[PDB]
Design a protein around this ligand. Sequence first.
Ligand SMILES: COCC(CCO[C@H]1CC[C@@]2(C)C(=CC[C@H]3[C@@H]4C[C@@H]5O[C@]6(CC[C@@H](C)CO6)[C@@H](C)[C@@H]5[C@@]4(C)CC[C@@H]32)C1)COC
Ligand SMILES: *[C@@H]1O[C@H](CO)[C@@H](O)[C@H](O)[C@H]1NC(C)=O
Ligand SMILES: *[C@@H]1O[C@H](CO)[C@@H](O)[C@H](O)[C@H]1NC(C)=O
Ligand SMILES: *[C@@H]1O[C@H](CO)[C@@H](O)[C@H](O)[C@H]1NC(C)=O
Ligand SMILES: *[C@@H]1O[C@H](CO)[C@@H](O)[C@H](O)[C@H]1NC(C)=O
Lengths: 1138, 111
Amino acid sequence: PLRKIAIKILVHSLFSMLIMCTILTNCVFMTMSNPPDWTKNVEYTFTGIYTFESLIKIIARGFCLEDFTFLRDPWNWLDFTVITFAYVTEFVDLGNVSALRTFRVLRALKTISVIPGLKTIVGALIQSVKKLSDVMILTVFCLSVFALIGLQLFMGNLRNKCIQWPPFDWKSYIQDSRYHYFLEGFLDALLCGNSSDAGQCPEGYMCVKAGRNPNYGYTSFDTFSWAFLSLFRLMTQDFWENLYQLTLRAAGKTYMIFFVLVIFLGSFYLINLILAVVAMAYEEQNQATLEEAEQDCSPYWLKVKHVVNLVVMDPFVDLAITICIVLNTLFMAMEHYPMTDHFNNVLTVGNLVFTGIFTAEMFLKIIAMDPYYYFQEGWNIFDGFIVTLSLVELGLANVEGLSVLRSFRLLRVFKLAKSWPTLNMLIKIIGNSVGALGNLTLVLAIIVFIFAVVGMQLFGKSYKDCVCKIASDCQLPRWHMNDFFHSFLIVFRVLCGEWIETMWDCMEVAGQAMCLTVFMMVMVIGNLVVLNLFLALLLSSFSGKQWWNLRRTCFRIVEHNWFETFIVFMILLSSGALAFEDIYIDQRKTIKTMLEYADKVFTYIFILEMLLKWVAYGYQTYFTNAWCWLDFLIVDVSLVSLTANALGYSELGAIKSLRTLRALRPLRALSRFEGMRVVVNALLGAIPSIMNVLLVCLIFWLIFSIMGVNLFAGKFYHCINTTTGDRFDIEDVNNHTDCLKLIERNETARWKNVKVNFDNVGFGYLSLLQVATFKGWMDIMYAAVDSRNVELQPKYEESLYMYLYFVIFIIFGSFFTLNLFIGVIIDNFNQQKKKFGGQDIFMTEEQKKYYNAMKKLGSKKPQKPIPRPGNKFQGMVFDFVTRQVFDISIMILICLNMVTMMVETDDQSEYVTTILSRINLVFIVLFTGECVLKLISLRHYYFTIGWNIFDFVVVILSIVGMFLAELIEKYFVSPTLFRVIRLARIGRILRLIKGAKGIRTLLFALMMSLPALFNIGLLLFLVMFIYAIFGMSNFAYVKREVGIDDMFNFETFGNSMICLFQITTSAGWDGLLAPILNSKPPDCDPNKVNPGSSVKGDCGNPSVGIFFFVSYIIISFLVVVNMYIAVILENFSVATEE
Amino acid sequence: TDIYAVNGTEILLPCTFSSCFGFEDLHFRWTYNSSDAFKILIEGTVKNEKSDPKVTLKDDDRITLVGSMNNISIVLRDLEFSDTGKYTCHVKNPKENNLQHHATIFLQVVD
Ligand SMILES: COCC(CCO[C@H]1CC[C@@]2(C)C(=CC[C@H]3[C@@H]4C[C@@H]5O[C@]6(CC[C@@H](C)CO6)[C@@H](C)[C@@H]5[C@@]4(C)CC[C@@H]32)C1)COC
Ligand SMILES: *[C@@H]1O[C@H](CO)[C@@H](O)[C@H](O)[C@H]1NC(C)=O
Ligand SMILES: *[C@@H]1O[C@H](CO)[C@@H](O)[C@H](O)[C@H]1NC(C)=O
Ligand SMILES: *[C@@H]1O[C@H](CO)[C@@H](O)[C@H](O)[C@H]1NC(C)=O
Ligand SMILES: *[C@@H]1O[C@H](CO)[C@@H](O)[C@H](O)[C@H]1NC(C)=O
């Protein structure tokens, strides 16, 4: 009766399903922004349902007064909390203004409770997060050390502005930001610098450090905490190029060494270690799970189907189907924008013909297997779906913007999965996504929903109540959290890695602490779940007396030791002689002619060496070597230009472009150094599988490219008034004819294109690369979301939901394709490492033996290196100082010194500076006492282990650094040199690695990965050199648009190498390609007298620019993936071997 | 919301605004609406967030500004039954192209 009824309903699936549907419906309700009146009483019913649930539960676990009710389950705590808050808020007042509304989304976390199969997933996520302790300690230590470095170096440098002059006075004429230079609508106060190789300034604009900071005041290298924020954003390479530029524009180009260091240390090694530890945990997790699991109608219908059945099984008819699919692919891939009906006719006719033959083959083949006796293979169902939908969309011709059904015929390309096995692998993974890994991606979707509503409740009203703080026309920005869709788009962006540009706008409108906590929690939890899902899909899918006498002599010559060394010396010098071809080369006349003579001397000596190789080797032994062919090709290209400049064909359409073929000259060093030859062999040994998979990725991107051509490619055009680069509203101009009505009225409206669009399938392949690399997708999406209609003016967010197209692509074509690529890479590298039988590729033949001796240097420990100080007061001193208490006290002391080093701050008083200098002097004296005393307790060696040696070194350096602090005020003075020399005290902080046994192991794995990364770094440097000379020959005169300015361009070798290093991480290449894609007026001026040269024209060729940048993106991507693997395969072999 | 006051007494009708980052040249207006009448009761300007309101129109001598928060509340004294009706405070920020209408107060004067 009383308790009987209660306990029965509780454990029935019907009640659980009821609660689950209520939970989901309430999830869908909380999605709204301003729920109307009735929604209220809906929430009342929801509270009543949850009350009845908890009532059943308490009557079940606490019936007839037994001492308490249901409390051991952590989720029951959550349920109790939410119902408590619900019926505590019901009480009339809990603040009025209301801040507790965010707490209600906790009822949407109750999902994880009932969804059968999610508690294990969350508990297994936590178990994978447990392993990251030491790596977190390491990454915060390194972030702090480098933050101190950037603090001391760039102390207040980020405030450097460019003040003008006026028409007793100070500290009020350096503010107001009206006397500062604003570079044409940038709202940020262009930076400057006193030093040379720093940011220059216009006429009458001196450099004085005075103002807020870059961005909004959140970017600076003073007040430690901000340096930690900035170096954390540098760790994730999140718009890091902007720091790199703003810093080199204020502190000087020579500080790019610090950025190379930061990047290569933090942005690479920390991420590699995080990923290796997460993967290590995941791998053993599944290994343990496996191990634990280890212990007259019908008669005549048959008569007519008789003959048709005995037609289609034997011939190549379902191969004709294959070729028909492949040809329909090409027919639908020939679509573009313009087109002349003499082409659209062929298009529609071929489309109808293909639809026809396919549905005919369907209706014929269907009666050979009996309907119902035909819908059993799986592929037949899909074929039927396609054919049906094709026939349906055919005779409709009404869908306004819903013409997507023209792309539903594109799915039939998946029918190739019958023969094509790698596309079958891709389908396998994209289906496992919702299969064995359906609950984990459900957890991920829940988390994205929770975050998208949490941010929308916390910060939602603020984005509208203080718009004018982040705005120009007091309207919502492109990304915000006012409603659920944009709030979900921001969480997705943050999951993509772009978490800072919106974090500034969050903090500016809703308080620093609240946005910091939410955004850090988001970019930690969500990225951890995404990485766990990635690894889950990955690790489960693949689970003559003189004639002969002279040959001897020249053979002795070519194999002599001096000859190859002299030839590689000549190669290095002839390669260096290319770097001096700046714009100023026509302004020297003393090095120009010497370089001209050297260009011929090198050509002749490289001809003589090729002739000697011919003679001493013979054509058969010569032409069967790849490297000799590579070398002979370059000497051939040089000979062509030499005969051209010697016979009389001086300047032509070809010989002028053959001088740029000299840029390939550095390739002659690849066959000389083992470091680059080994890497080239390792890439050429694994390129075929990469090709095989690239085919699948290219077809899968062709699908999305045709989709984008169908949805876009004609709506990216817009008229802007050229005076300000603005957008012509729909109230003013509606479409093409109105803008051509304006231009005819002698107005200034530009009917302009985006220049990175979907107009063809080629431009589609390029837009998709920017969207999949997350560099440049902003303008693409702002033009695609405003895509009103072809030939119609685009309006601000009218076709708003097209964001889902790019979201779907970023999922499929970027997550899953990369998963497949990593899988096949693991497979082929496994096969490789198995065939070699040996180990450690990417290493030369002498680096391997130096690697072997360090592997022994890593596994050992000292034993009693301390006889005694015999018999003196030194005996009791040794008794006192050797103990563990003194060793741990010194570490606490070093930690305290690190704390008093964190208190430094730009623009502090003299009082604070004085007391800080004094306490640092006391610390120096205390550590000096430490060491000198330690020299009396161990006064026979003191110098066995390297740690006390490093202490000796840092103590000496600190004593020096303090001893000349008075030399700066009496002899040779330089402040920028003082900032650099004072950095020697940070070496004291580096003694913290002595005791934390475990962070030392990771740095030892670093030491292990150094020699294998050195070779790849040399090869990347060589590729960077070649591309730098190519850009300095081609791109060195382009217009100075968004991406190329007076500081970062291709004019000299310096600027070119610092732009190439920026692109090396694929960062900001969309802005560098943006000026090159210009071709003709009214964009450029192809006839420009531009000084210091005979060359004329102010922008480059789009074809060569696209080839350059895409070629470099792909090559650098391959090179950095092999660096990633060279770090990870060593990370694995040190944690499995311990 | 609603508000009940006794004939012959006084009543404070509240209006507070807040600004996330201050303002310049704010304009305000209180209105009265009944079934057959509309009145502009008081209008004024506030130069910035550090200034007191300046009244530029007052059409009833029984109305006074309360004085300062970001406050343009008014007190209406010597209430009569004909004062029953709807009172609304409107705040305009020309520079932000912003206009806020605060919730209408229905004042019921009673015997
Ligand atoms: C099956 O047995 C093989 C076993 C090791 C197999 O475990 C693998 C688990 C995944 C893991 C950690 C492995 C190697 C490359 C790793 C990738 C390098 C890529 O680098 C990135 C970063 C840079 C971007 C350009 C894209 O690629 C990451 C996304 C990619 C990456 C971090 C994803 C995770 C990969 C090892 C060997 O045992 C001795
Ligand atoms: C730059 O130089 C000017 C004068 O040459 C000086 O007044 C100013 O303080 C300097 N600023 C910095 C940051 O060096
Ligand atoms: C373009 O903008 C300028 C100033 O921003 C404006 O004066 C001009 O009228 C605009 N173009 C047209 C066609 O109105
Ligand atoms: C463009 O819009 C105007 C608006 O009235 C209309 O008259 C005109 O026909 C439209 N032209 C096209 C090609 O859409
Ligand atoms: C507009 O420009 C054309 C050519 O630049 C010129 O001939 C014409 O006089 C100008 N004015 C008008 C009203 O067409």
